[PDB]
Amino acid sequence: QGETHEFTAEISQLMSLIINTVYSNKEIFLRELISNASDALDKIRYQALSDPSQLESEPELFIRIIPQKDQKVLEIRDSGIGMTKADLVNNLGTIAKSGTKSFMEALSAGADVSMIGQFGVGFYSLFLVADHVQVISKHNDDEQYVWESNAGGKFTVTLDETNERLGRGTMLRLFLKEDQLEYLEEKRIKEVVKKHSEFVAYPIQLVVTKEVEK
Amino acid sequence: QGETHEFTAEISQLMSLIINTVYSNKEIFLRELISNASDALDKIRYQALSDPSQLESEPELFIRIIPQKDQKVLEIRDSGIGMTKADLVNNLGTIAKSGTKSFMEALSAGADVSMIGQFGVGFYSLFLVADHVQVISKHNDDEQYVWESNGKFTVTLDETNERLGRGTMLRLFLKEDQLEYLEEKRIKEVVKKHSEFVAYPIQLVVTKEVEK
Ligand SMILES: C[C@@H]1C[C@H]2O[C@@H]2/C=C\C=C\C(=O)Cc2c(Cl)c(O)cc(O)c2C(=O)O1
Ligand SMILES: C[C@@H]1C[C@H]2O[C@@H]2/C=C\C=C\C(=O)Cc2c(Cl)c(O)cc(O)c2C(=O)O1
Ligand SMILES: [Mg+2]
């Protein structure tokens, strides 16, 4: 029952730029996704001021990073406001954010890719480190959905009948490129996170899997 | 489409015994579940010698322990052979396995619970530390199912949990006085003490907040 959609041209152009012309500072993808998560948590907190029942779906407010070495996947989960189906379709492909063209012009003018969040399209920096991505999201009073794309021209949005229940919020699953597997290692993730985590108000949890020795 | 079934008498009788018992070595539940996991992995490993395609669904052979503190749940996952819908219905409630009665009679006579695995029903020692349990399982060429009981149980097509690929995951809803088994140090102690001779990696998933 999976809708298929095409990326709007400006977003396809933006991903083209990012994938093909940005050679350094690829680690900023994690700052950008942590920022999106923090914003999403801000939003549910705001709603909770007028209606504290909105937090009941998932009471703890967190940002969680989960390296999955077996699958060569890096997951980033938050318990923020989450997204409906229409939210996923519009925020992540069909509507070009106002800043998309502006950001492409800024890159051409000499901007560092680190600036991408100032233009509201920080999501797309993940394609610096991944060719395939799933976005799982759960909004109050709606079902859980999965958005998926392979850094191409189309994406799908489907009712989620295969992933763990989020309760509320969003989880990105980054299928990392073969030369970008450094981001599955605890020490590298901590290094990158500590650079820009001094003013994040929420706990950033790192899930590490280690074999029991002895 | 969730089939609901009643526990067979001898199994319901057994769980009552275990759940109510006063034991001091309740930590043996983890040895029993790790042993079940190791057995399931042996079986898919052997089958894969004649048909290596059987591992493609989940190429890694592992035992994975995942404390979920927010939910007060301890998960134990393996990539073994898994169970069909019929396997779940029969193995875990409707058919009393040979040795169910024998172990209950031994327990009533005073035997230590540590003996349960020799009767092949070590699964039910999880009720030493949990009141509710879900068993998620995926066998090759069948769908993923969830068995659940908190004196009836249900088996349902799994459309809510992470895909296992292949194998089995127990989700133990721990009693309020048994939450020590969510702590990294306690689990490592129990694993090193009683599961030292397992042929597969036993992985512990630990969540730690980053110092911002
Ligand atoms: C619409 C909601 C709430 C918005 O406040 C967040 C700010 C920017 C979000 C941009 C998005 O594209 C969706 C999104 C992404 Cl990409 C992410 O990594 C994490 C998230 O939690 C959300 C989200 O759930 O977004
Ligand atoms: C039927 C298969 C293969 C069997 O060889 C294992 C030996 C005993 C298993 C007993 C069971 O009740 C099912 C089971 C349990 Cl309880 C468990 O904790 C972990 C598992 O991986 C399996 C399983 O998938 O078992
Ligand atoms: Mg072994």
Residue numbers in the entry:
A (entry chain A): 5 to 218
B (entry chain B): 5 to 154, 157 to 218
Sentences from the paper on this structure:
Hsp90 is essential in all eukaryotes where it regulates the form and function of diverse client proteins, many of which are key signal transducers. Hsp90 enables drug resistance via multiple molecular mechanisms, most notably through the stabilization of the stress-activated protein phosphatase calcineurin and multiple components of Pkc1 mitogen-activated protein kinase (MAPK) cell wall integrity pathway. Hsp90 also serves as the previously enigmatic thermal sensor that controls temperature-dependent morphogenetic switching in C. albicans, a key factor contributing to the organism’s virulence. To identify potentially exploitable differences in the Hsp90 expressed by a fungal pathogen vs humans, we determined the crystal structure of the C. albicans Hsp90 N-terminal domain, which includes the nucleotide-binding pocket targeted by all Hsp90 inhibitors in clinical development.
We obtained structures for the domain under three conditions: apo (unliganded), in complex with ADP, and in complex with the prototypical inhibitor radicicol. Despite the presence of different ligands, overlay of the three crystal structures showed an almost identical conformation for this domain with a root mean square deviation (r.m.s.d.) of 1.32 Å or less over all atoms. Global structural similarity between fungal and human Hsp90 was also observed when comparing the chaperone-ADP and -radicicol complexes. Additionally, the N-terminal domain of C. albicans Hsp90 shares the same architecture at the nucleotide-binding site, which interacts with both ADP and radicicol through hydrogen-bond interactions at the same amino acids (Asp92 and Thr174). In initial work, the crystal structures of apo, ADP-bound, and radicicol-bound fungal NBD showed minimal structural variation. More problematic, they also showed little variation with respect to the human NBD. The natural product radicicol was the only Hsp90 inhibitor found to significantly inhibit growth of our engineered fungal strain.
